[PDB]
Every structure is written in structure tokens, then in C-alpha cells.
């Protein structure tokens, strides 16, 4: 839907954790939703973050595993979340 978070980086990593930062999209966001899980597998964990926050910490990962980290914009207006931006990082 085009108004999607414009970048998503891993700012600092330990073998079992990541500190991701995204940059807000052009439109006002009420909250962000972030999922993460192993690339290729259907399971993922989920947690929400206030609209004023652009960084989150992901903990409890296994070392040397490719995880897929996805961020969505959340709006109270909308039934569904915004378009996602996602990367892949190896712990």
C-alpha cells in the first residue's frame, strides 16, 4: 500500500539477540507489528510496539541461524496491517 516502513536494519547483534531499527513511513502510524522466525519455516513470534518507537530488541534466538524479520505498520483505522518490509539476518 506504498506507505510501508522505508528501511530496516540490524543495529547491534549478539549470537542470541538482535536490535532492529526501522524508519517510519510517510503516513502517521499508530503502532508497529514485528514478526520473526526461521527462514523457510511457518512459525513466527509476534509483538507490537507504540507508534512513537522505531527500534525493537529481538531476544532468544539460536546462534548461526537465518531469521526473517518483518515489520508492519498498524493503524486503528484499518482492518488489516500495512504493507511489510522484511530482511533476513543470520545470528
Amino acid at each position: 500500500v506504498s506507505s510501508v516502513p522505508t528501511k530496516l536494519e540490524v543495529v547491534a547483534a549478539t549470537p542470541t539477540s538482535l536490535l532492529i531499527s526501522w524508519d517510519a513511513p510517510a503516513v502517521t502510524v499508530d503502532y508497529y507489528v514485528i514478526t520473526y522466525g526461521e527462514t523457510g519455516y511457518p512459525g513466527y513470534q509476534e509483538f507490537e510496539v507504540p507508534g512513537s518507537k522505531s527500534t525493537a530488541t529481538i531476544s532468544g534466538l539460536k546462534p548461526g541461524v537465518d531469521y526473517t524479520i518483518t515489520v508492519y505498520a498498524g493503524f486503528t483505522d484499518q482492518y488489516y496491517y500495512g504493507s511489510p518490509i522484511s530482511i533476513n539476518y543470520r545470528t
Binding site: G37, Y41, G43, E46
Partner: protein
Amino acid sequence: SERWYHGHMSGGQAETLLQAKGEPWTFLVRESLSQPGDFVLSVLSDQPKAGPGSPLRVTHIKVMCEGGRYTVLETFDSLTDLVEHFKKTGIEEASGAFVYLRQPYY
């Protein structure tokens, strides 16, 4: 085959619902708010989120739906046939990590 389905429900509300009624392998099906038309299998694991006493880790599994078929491989006619199939052996949520569907959340 319909009472474990909760429709428009967020992943975080599922977590809150499953962690409070905190018995392992309690599951429910909800539509995905990230992809319309798909659904999510939200399962309460037996693994604590942290140390002893902490809530149990909730795991969400994408179930894709196109052409009237349902998949998480193989496909299924309905969400019931999917849930019924994985109730037997479980879902490999991650490399070597399985979740099991024992108790439906009504």
C-alpha cells in the same frame, strides 16, 4: 471444527488468551491481519518465555489459502481438515521445533 476459530483476532490477543489459560498445546485459529484471506494457527507451547514461572511461549503458524485450498507441502479442503491432520503429529514450527494441537481454546 468451528469453536477453535475466533475470526478477526490479533496475534497479541491470542497470546494473552492462551497464556492466561496457561496449559501447553492449547491452540486456536484466527484470520491473519497481515495477509487477508490467510489464517494463523496460534499455539501455546510448553517452553517458558524466560525463567521459571514466566508465561509460556506462544507460537503463530501461517496457514495460506488460495483456490479454496489451505496449506502451511500438502493442501486441505478446509481449515478443519488441516487442524485434524496436524493434531496427530504436530507442526514443525522451526528447524526441529514442533508444536502440538491438543486442547482447543473455546
